[PDB]
């Protein structure tokens, strides 16, 4: 019956909160990177769960700790950390395998067209 805080004991740490996009998404992320920003939107990087390291470009994902720097002119937060490592737990929580497949099969992210003309 070995469970432990992992799945038994109450608040392990004591009170601290293990981050969360909904709260620390747009504003938060945008604060980590700064002014700079590629074709995509920082808010997007926040959606996937990418927290910069106090400097623009280089950012590590939560749980999957994927360190990505020097993104591509045509890409997206999810597409990057996902494809690179299709096993980001934090991702499964964001939009589950549903989105995971969205990328590893077709083009994910990038909207504004609704129906893509």
């Amino acid at each position: 019956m070995s469970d432990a805080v992992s799945s038994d004991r109450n608040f392990p740490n004591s009170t601290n909160l293990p981050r969360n996009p909904s709260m620390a998404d747009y504003e938060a992320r945008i604060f980590t990177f700064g002014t700079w920003i590629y074709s995509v939107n920082k808010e997007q990087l926040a959606r996937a769960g990418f927290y910069a390291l106090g400097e623009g470009d280089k950012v590590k994902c939560f749980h999957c700790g994927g360190g990505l720097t020097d993104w591509k002119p045509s890409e997206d937060p999810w597409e990057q950390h996902a494809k690179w490592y299709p096993g980001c737990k934090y991702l499964l929580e964001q939009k589950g395998q549903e989105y995971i497949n969205n990328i590893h099969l077709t083009h994910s992210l990038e909207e504004c067209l609704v129906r893509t003309t």
């Binding site: 280089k58 360190g67 990505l68 720097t69 020097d70 993104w71 591509k72 890409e75 990057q80 690179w84």
Partner: peptide
């Protein structure tokens, strides 16, 4: 995006 890594190469 390129893989950070760095470490020692």
């Amino acid at each position: 995006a390129v893989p950070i890594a760095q470490k020692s190469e």
